[PDB]
A paper describes a structure:
The bacteriophage ϕ29, a representative of bacteriophages with a short non-contractile tail, has an ~19 kb dsDNA genome encoding ~20 proteins. Both 5ʹ ends of the genome are covalently connected to the terminal protein gene product 3 (gp3). ϕ29 infects the Gram-positive Bacillus subtilis cells by injecting the genome–gp3 complex into the host-cell cytoplasm using a short non-contractile tail, leaving the genome emptied virion on the cell surface. Here, we report the cryo-electron microscopy (cryo-EM) structural studies of the ϕ29 prohead, the mature and the genome-emptied virions at near-atomic resolutions up to 3.2 Å. Our results show structural details of the complex capsid, the DNA packaging motor and the entire tail machinery, and provide a molecular basis for understanding the assembly, maturation and infection mechanisms of the bacteriophage ϕ29.
We calculated the cryo-electron microscopy (cryoEM) reconstructions of the ϕ29 prohead, the mature head and the genome emptied head to a resolution of 3.6, 3.2, and 3.2 Å, respectively. Our results showed that the 448-amino-acid-long polypeptide chain of the [name] [name] folds into three structural domains: the small N-terminal helix domain (the [name]-N-helix domain, residues 1–61), the central HK97 fold domain (the [name]-HK97 domain, residues 62–347) and the C-terminal immunoglobulin-like domain (the [name]-C-Ig domain, residues 348–448). The total 235 [name] subunits assemble into a ~520 Å long and 400 Å wide, T = 3, Q = 5 prolate icosahedron of 30 flat hexameric capsomeres and 11 concave pentameric capsomeres. Structural comparisons using the HK97 domains showed significantly greater variation in the hexameric capsomeres than that in the pentameric capsomeres (an average r.m.s.d. of 2.2 Å vs. 0.6 Å between the aligned Cα atoms of the corresponding HK97 domains of the mature head capsomeres). With the cryoEM map of the mature head calculated at a resolution of 3.2 Å, we determined the structure of the pseudo-hexagonal base of the head fiber (residues 1–110 of [name]). Six β-barrel domains from three [name] monomers form the pseudo-hexagonal base of each head fiber, which interact with one C-Ig from a pentameric capsomer with a contact surface area of ~620 Å2 and two C-Igs each from a different hexameric capsomer with an average contact surface area of ~400 Å2. Further analysis showed that the icosahedral end caps of the mature head expanded slightly upon the loading of the genome. However, structural comparisons of individual hexameric and pentameric capsomeres within the icosahedral end caps showed a similar average r.m.s.d. of 0.4 Å, indicating that the expansion in the icosahedral end caps mainly occurs through the rigid-body movements of the capsomeres. As have been shown in the head comparisons, the E loop in contact with the pRNA has an outward shift of ~3 Å in the mature head. In addition, we did not observe any pRNA density in the 3.2 Å mature capsid map.
Residue numbers in the entry:
A (entry chain 7c), B (entry chain 9P): 170 to 281
The structure:
């Protein structure tokens, strides 16, 4: 009787409660007009759909913290411990300054 | 007449335009074959469905920037201000080096 009453085969499969993946694609298209949402409903959105779906919900991509560069904000590693200076001569004061410089160089806080 | 024409109860509920949550689960299964997409359509995907849905669209999880460790890339906090050195003796030069070391230690740029 459903064959006598309905022409569309995707509708008929829905009414029989047995749909193929192709029937589901067509039925999704009857229910939703946004192309990026249709991409989501397929379970296999295109690259363009993915970008647009994130825009649609205001979502970001997985963020990876980059190392600091001389031009670009980034993360650093924390420098090793450095002892306060008790230098009473120039040679030692210079030794202590250099220890700080190397620590900052080691942590990528300053350039080589 | 629909009772005389169709055997499937979930199809019949669809044709009456009145579906329960159970009818909707069954109708989803007639329309879509991918198990992870069926999880999404339920509104309550399992843990496995969630992982697979993200894979399906190439999405990442919420990213949290970890602190730098000696083995693993991470973020740092920016060090406090440090004055350029005008030291003319060793004691002062060492004092200034140590000030840099403590600043880098305070910001977790180098280890204690």
């Amino acid at each position: 009787l459903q064959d006598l009453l309905f022409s569309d085969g995707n509708v008929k499969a829905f009414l029989q409660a047995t749909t193929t993946d192709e029937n589901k694609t067509a039925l999704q298209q009857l229910l939703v007009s946004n192309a990026d949402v249709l991409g989501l409903l397929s379970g296999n959105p295109t690259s363009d759909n993915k970008i647009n779906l994130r825009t649609m919900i205001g979502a970001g991509v997985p963020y990876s913290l980059p190392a600091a560069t001389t031009t670009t904000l980034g993360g650093v590693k924390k420098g090793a411990a450095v002892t306060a200076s008790t230098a009473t001569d120039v040679a030692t004061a210079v030794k202590d300054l250099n220890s700080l410089i190397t620590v900052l160089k080691n942590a990528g806080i300053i350039s080589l």
